[PDB]
Design a protein around this ligand. Structure first.
Ligand SMILES: CN(C)C(=O)Cn1ncc2ccccc21
Length: 191
């Protein structure tokens, strides 16, 4: 979680899509959803990103409807956005035992309990926090069994990105768990 405000310049695809959904939160605008193989993925927008500006206009106080509206009525050649990097998240670095564990329990993306004398504890992993990314990869919407496989298949060093569940649950409301799994960008970054 960089503590930085960054510029990104966008370019609509042939369908005139960027691949993005924005949710009004606390009078900000925040990335609800990032489509795979989308202009928005390529410039690196991520779930939980804050959109400070769209085309040099502040987003403070905009409805989700107005942000999506703004986005359609944009010219399409260049859409310059100002991004604050994933304000509502935090990233933990953990190591595995020889039993291959970081040492916690989660259910529906959300961590429910922490297992004592584990790296999860040594590093102060919290509960009631939804798993947002793992080692770069947005896992929002995957099944628990699939998340487990990614942690299984991770090296010894695992890097998790969490969000308070009350915030998490406010971002994802009005987005179907179908689309969460289908079209949300669950991919490693292109270089
Ligand atoms: C942000 N929202 C709700 C929309 O963009 C909905 N929408 N779709 C087509 C269309 C045409 C004129 C006005 C709103 C229109």
């Amino acid at each position: 979680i960089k503590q930085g405000i960054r510029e990104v310049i966008l370019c609509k695809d042939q369908d005139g899509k960027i691949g993005l959904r924005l949710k009004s939160i606390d009078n900000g605008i925040f990335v609800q959803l990032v489509q795979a193989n989308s202009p928005a993925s390529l410039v690196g927008l991520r779930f939980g990103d804050q959109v400070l500006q769209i085309n040099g206009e502040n987003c403070a106080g905009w409805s989700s409807d107005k942000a999506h509206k703004v986005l359609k009525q944009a010219f399409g050649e260049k859409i310059t956005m100002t991004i604050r990097d994933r304000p509502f998240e935090r990233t933990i670095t953990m190591h595995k035992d020889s039993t291959g564990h970081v040492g916690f329990i989660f259910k529906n993306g959300k961590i429910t309990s922490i297992v004592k004398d584990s790296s999860a504890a040594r590093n102060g992993l919290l509960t009631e926090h939804n798993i947002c990314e793992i080692n770069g990869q947005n896992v929002i919407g995957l099944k628990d069994s699939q998340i487990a496989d990614i942690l299984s298949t991770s090296g010894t060093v695992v890097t998790i990105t969490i969000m308070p569940a009350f915030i998490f649950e406010h971002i994802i409301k009005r987005m179907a768990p179908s689309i969460m799994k289908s079209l949300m960008d669950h991919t490693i970054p292109e270089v």
